[PDB]
Amino acid sequence: LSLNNLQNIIYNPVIPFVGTIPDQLDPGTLIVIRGHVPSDADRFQVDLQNGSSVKPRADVAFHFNPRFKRAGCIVCNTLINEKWGREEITYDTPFKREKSFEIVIMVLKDKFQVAVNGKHTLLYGHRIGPEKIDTLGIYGKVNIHSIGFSFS
Numbered sequence: 111l112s113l114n115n116l117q118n119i120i121y122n123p124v125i126p127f128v129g130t131i132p133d134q135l136d137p138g139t140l141i142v143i144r145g146h147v148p149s150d151a152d153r154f155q156v157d158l159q160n161g162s163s164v165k166p167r168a169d170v171a172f173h174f175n176p177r178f179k180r181a182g183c184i185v186c187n188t189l190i191n192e193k194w195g196r197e198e199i200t201y202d203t204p205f206k207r208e209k210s211f212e213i214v215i216m217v218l219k220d221k222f223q224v225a226v227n228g229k230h231t232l233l234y235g236h237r238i239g240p241e242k243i244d245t246l247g248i249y250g251k252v253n254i255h256s257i258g259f260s261f262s
Contacts, residue, residue: 116258127248128162133261135217135240140260145253146210153177154250160242167192171238172222176205188237200232
């Protein structure tokens with residue numbers, strides 16, 4: 111699966127980052143996030159959100175949260191009407207402190223498919239319609255090299 115036609119590319123964004131996604135996340139669209147975690151980082155998160163409201167809090171369709179303590183994990187969840195759901199934890203994680211990642215989030219009709227550095231990482235079934243997603247948030251101790259979208 112190819113990373114062709116990446117557009118609206120932002121390099122070295124300031125973190126915390128909150129940015130409007132330039133087009134609708136229809137099936138087969140990609141979000142590509144490249145970066146690395148510093149040596150003192152314990153976690154970071156990527157949030158695909160319905161808007162950028164703070165109070166009331168924006169719904170988070172997809173919360174993708176690598177954690178680095180010990181052998182590490184990835185926590186995924188959704189926030190609806192200011193309440194987190196039950197998390198889905200993935201223990202087979204490719205993330206390491208000081209190791210770079212290319213996170214590819216592919217939106218399908220029924221789920222997100224996430225790959226890191228060209229290798230499948232996890233699936234996450236939609237709990238909110240992906241058509242409602244228009245905002246990308248990135249928070250925590252993380253150095254983001256680039257953010258890009260594939261709509262074409």
